């Protein structure tokens, strides 16, 4: 297996065959990188947690040797042409960047947000129940607009702007035209920049306001840093969630017995959302690291300066922790999944995500119980060649009845 990673996700109900055969060989294997390099590939679940929690495996893209797995040469160069992202800093510097935002995702904080989320979901579910289309693309009706608007709600954009925020955000993930996206971000970075300025003078009940207040009361303002935060949040939480919604439906639909459980008792939904996250693990290899020291792990001696890639999808399908990992079992209480990562960088909005999905799945199947795929499974175009797994478009329908 001189194989060169990454390997495309060809089947949405089983990870690349090569992945399993790699784990069967060892918890950690040195692999070939299509990008040209070479790096360590962690397939074992225990080792996955190990590295992701071990600070010796840096996430700083400013370091020579950082793996070009999910990164371009140009993408790496861009990151080295601006301040580091939270997703790219270590220890103290990281902590300092995360502490001031941890509060925006507490149980209480997110609790007050719930209603706003429900309303957004209900709205689009409505728009669906009134479409003049035979088949409807669940991706453009639900998947995309929901996470984006939920986030702008969080940041604090006025309701009177949802349409704008929805169109630019949606285009920033456009499939065609590298310029449309560029033009999308552009118009947004402008909106957000001024929106914040407005907030500085007469705030409200949003993240922006609360942030501007802390910086003032604490040390001093950082307009750019705040503008940067907004995008970090939108960026790391829009497509991931969207794709999770898409795959969540397809997964639930392709497993009736499981869908009935969720549809029968909504209290079982939260645990179902966890199984769905493990099952698909759409962030698979975004957890690339750069060893800054020599480390003995997984029975392998990793030398400093070498790249380390943690495969979350591989860890979440590790049979040594998840009995029959190949089966979609909403019932299993198997905690410890890594779809959200592990360690210092574990997903900051993992709970906002859990909330969205939970609300989306319940509402969707409660309001449109007979929802089914408008086309055969093999026809649904999955984003199997994308860094973050998902589905390009998902045609669907339901039964319009009479009494």
Q: Which residue positions form the known binding site?
A: 94, 98, 289, 345, 347
Q: What is the DSSP letter of 139?
A: I
Quick check: 68 binds ligand HEM (CB under 6 A)?
no
Question: What phi, psi does 302 have (nearest 5°)?
Answer: -90, 125
Contact call for residue 249 and ligand HEM (CB under 6 A): no
Contact segment (CB under 6 A) with ligand HEM among 202-210, 246-254, 323-331, 347-355 equals 347-355
Span from 216-224, 235-243, 267-275, 369-377 in contact with ligand HEM (CB under 6 A): 235-243
| Residue 316 Cβ vs ligand HEM, minimum distance, rounded to whole Å | 11
Tell me which of 3, 14, 232, 375 binds ligand HEM, using CB under 6 A.
232
* Contact pick of 58, 148, 211, 241 for ligand HEM (by CB under 6 A): 241
276 is a contact residue toward ligand HEM (CB under 6 A): no
Which residues in the chain are followed by a discontinuity, with C-to-N distance exceeding 2.5 angstroms?
none
Query: Among 351, 139, 97, which Cα is nearest to 245's?
Result: 139
Element (H, E) at 287: strand 287-291
CA atoms within 13 A on the CB side of 137: 10
| Rounded Cα gap, residues 165 and 169, in angstroms | 6
Stretch that binds ligand HEM, among 37-45, 112-120, 125-133, 236-244 (CB under 6 A): 236-244
Query: Does residue 348 interact with ligand HEM by CB under 6 A?
Result: yes
Both tokens of 81, joined, read 């042409």
> Does 309 interact with ligand HEM (rule: CB under 6 A)?
no
**Helix/strand/coil for 124:** helix
As a whole number of angstroms, the distance between CA 151 and CA 294 comes to 41
Which residue in the shown chain puts its C-beta closest to ligand HEM?
A: 349
Closer CB to ligand HEM, 124 or 342, in the complex: 342
**Least gap, CB of 378 to ligand HEM (angstroms):** 26
360 lines the binding site for ligand HEM (CB under 6 A): no
* Selected binder of ligand HEM within 287, 311, 314, 316 (CB under 6 A): 287
User: Quick check: 145 binds ligand HEM (CB under 6 A)?
Assistant: no
Is 118 within 8 Å of 100 (Cβ atoms)? no
Task: State yes or no: residue 262 binds ligand HEM (CB under 6 A).
Answer: no
Angle ∠(88,93,94) on CA atoms, nearest 5: 50
Stretch that binds ligand HEM, among 27-35, 66-74, 336-344, 395-403 (CB under 6 A): 336-344
Q: Which residues are annotated as a binding site for heme b?
A: 94, 98, 289, 345, 347
User: Is 345 a residue that touches ligand HEM (CB under 6 A)?
Assistant: yes
DSSP 8-state symbol, 238? S
Pick one of 184, 347, 374, 380: the residue that binds ligand HEM (CB under 6 A): 347
Rule CB under 6 A: is residue 236 a binding residue for ligand HEM? Answer: yes
Of the pair 287, 311, the CB lying nearest ligand HEM is at 287
Residue 113 makes contact with ligand HEM by CB under 6 A: no
Question: Which residue, 286 or 330, has its beta carbon nearer to ligand HEM?
Answer: 286
Give me the sheet containing 372-373, strands edge to edge.
136-137, 395-397, 372-373
CA distance 79 to 72: 10
Annotate 46-109 with three-state secondary structure: HHHHHHHHCCCEECCCCCCCCCCCCCCHHHHHHHCCCCCCHHHCCHHHHHHHHHHHHHHHCHHH
CB of 302 to ligand HEM, least distance (A): 18
Is 286 one of the binding residues for ligand HEM (CB under 6 A)? yes
The three-state secondary structure class of 382 is strand
- For ligand HEM (CB under 6 A), the number of binding residues is 26
Question: CB 85: neighbour CB atoms within 10 A?
Answer: 17
Q: Does 340 bind ligand HEM (CB under 6 A)?
A: yes
What does the per-residue mask of binding to ligand HEM show for 38-67, with x meaning CB under 6 A? Answer: ---------------------x--------
The residue (of 188 and 348) whose beta carbon lies closer to ligand HEM is 348
| Phi-psi region at 36: left, alpha or beta (left = phi > 0; alpha = psi -120 to 50) | left
Contact status: 251 vs ligand HEM (CB under 6 A): no
H/E stretch holding 387 reads: none
Q: What angle do CA 141, 87, 180 make, to 5 degrees?
A: 40
Closest CA to 391 of 282, 286, 316, 273: 282
Q: What are the residues binding ligand HEM (CB under 6 A)?
A: 59, 86-87, 98, 151, 232-233, 236-237, 240-241, 244, 282-283, 286-287, 339-341, 344-345, 347-349, 352-353
């Amino acid at each position: 297996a001189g194989l060169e990673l990454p390997v495309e996700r060809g089947c949405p109900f089983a990870p690349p065959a090569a992945y399993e055969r790699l784990r069967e060989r060892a918890p950690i294997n040195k692999v070939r990188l299509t990008s040209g390099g070479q790096a360590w590939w962690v397939s074992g679940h225990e080792e996955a947690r190990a590295v992701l929690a071990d600070g010796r495996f840096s996430s700083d893209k400013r370091k020579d040797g950082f793996p070009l797995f999910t990164l371009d040469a140009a993408t790496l160069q861009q990151l080295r042409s601006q301040p580091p992202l939270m997703l790219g800093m270590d220890g103290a510097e990281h902590s300092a960047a995360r502490r001031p935002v941890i509060g925006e995702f507490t149980v209480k904080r997110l609790a007050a947000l719930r209603p706003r989320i429900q309303d957004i979901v209900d709205h689009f579910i409505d728009d669906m129940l009134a479409t003049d289309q035979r088949p409807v693309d669940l991706v453009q009706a639900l998947s995309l607009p929901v996470p984006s608007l939920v986030i702008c709600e969080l940041l604090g954009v006025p309701y009177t702007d949802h349409d704008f925020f929805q169109s630019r955000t949606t285009m920033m993930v456009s499939r065609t035209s590298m310029e449309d996206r560029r033009r999308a971000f552009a118009e947004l970075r402008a909106y957000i920049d001024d929106l914040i300025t407005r907030k500085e003078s007469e705030p409200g009940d949003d993240l922006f306001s609360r942030q501007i207040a802390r910086q003032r009361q604490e040390g001093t303002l950082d307009h750019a840093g705040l503008v940067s935060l907004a995008f970090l949040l939108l960026t790391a939480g829009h497509e991931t969630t969207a794709n999770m919604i898409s795959l969540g439906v397809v997964g639930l639909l392709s497993h009736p017995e499981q869908l009935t459980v969720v549809k029968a008792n909504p209290g079982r939904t939260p645990m179902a959302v966890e199984e769905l996250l493990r099952y698909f693990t759409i962030a698979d290899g975004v957890t690339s690291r750069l060893a800054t020291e020599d480390v003995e792990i997984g029975g392998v001696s990793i030398k400093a300066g070498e790249g380390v890639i943690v495969s979350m999808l591989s860890a979440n399908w590790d049979p040594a922790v998840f009995k029959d990992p190949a089966v979609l079992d909403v019932e299993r209480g198997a905690r410890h999944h890594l779809a959200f990562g592990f360690g210092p960088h574990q997903c900051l909005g993992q709970n906002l995500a859990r909330m969205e999905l939970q609300i989306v799945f319940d509402t969707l199947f409660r309001r449109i119980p007979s929802l089914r795929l408008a086309v055969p499974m093999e026809d649904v175009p999955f984003k199997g060649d994308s860094v973050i797994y998902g589905v390009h478009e998902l045609p669907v329908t339901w039964h319009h009845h009479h009494h």
